[PDB]
């Protein structure tokens, strides 16, 4: 499953992503829009043996389990099948998880690039929300 972007920004506001810690949902939907151009399934291999999952591309060394990551810790402990899901529930779970860890949305590498000190309202206008 690939959302649309209105879609996605009505998925992410039920799930209570809207302002949480701070963040309005704007940033959120750009995130997902860089990181795996909203792509629920989407991976992405790495140099260290991780690999990121799904449509928020959720690190299997730090944050859920493959199986096949040296140095994994599990910190939102979930398996990282979980994160392909067309269901965004365990996706947005992990990412309260990740944001709340320290750095806040910093921690996504498209969205500190793409993302911050833009209008990221604009990835919600023209959506019913």
Not at 24 to 45: D, H, I, M, P, Y
Request: aromatic share 10%; net charge positive; hydrophobic share 35%.
């Amino acid at each position: 499953k690939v959302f649309g972007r209105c879609e996605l920004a009505a998925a992410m506001k039920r799930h209570g992503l809207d302002n949480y810690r701070g963040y309005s949902l704007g940033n959120w939907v750009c995130a997902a829009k860089f990181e795996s151009n909203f792509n629920t399934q989407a991976t992405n291999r790495n140099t260290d043996g991780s690999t990121d999952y799904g449509i928020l591309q959720i690190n299997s060394r730090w944050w859920c389990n493959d199986g096949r990551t040296p140095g994994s810790r599990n910190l939102c402990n979930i398996p990282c099948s979980a994160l392909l899901s067309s269901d965004i529930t365990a996706s947005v779970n992990c990412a309260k998880k990740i944001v709340s860890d320290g750095n806040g949305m910093n921690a996504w590498v498209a969205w500190r690039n793409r993302c911050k000190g833009t209008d990221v309202q604009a990835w919600i206008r023209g959506c019913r929300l």
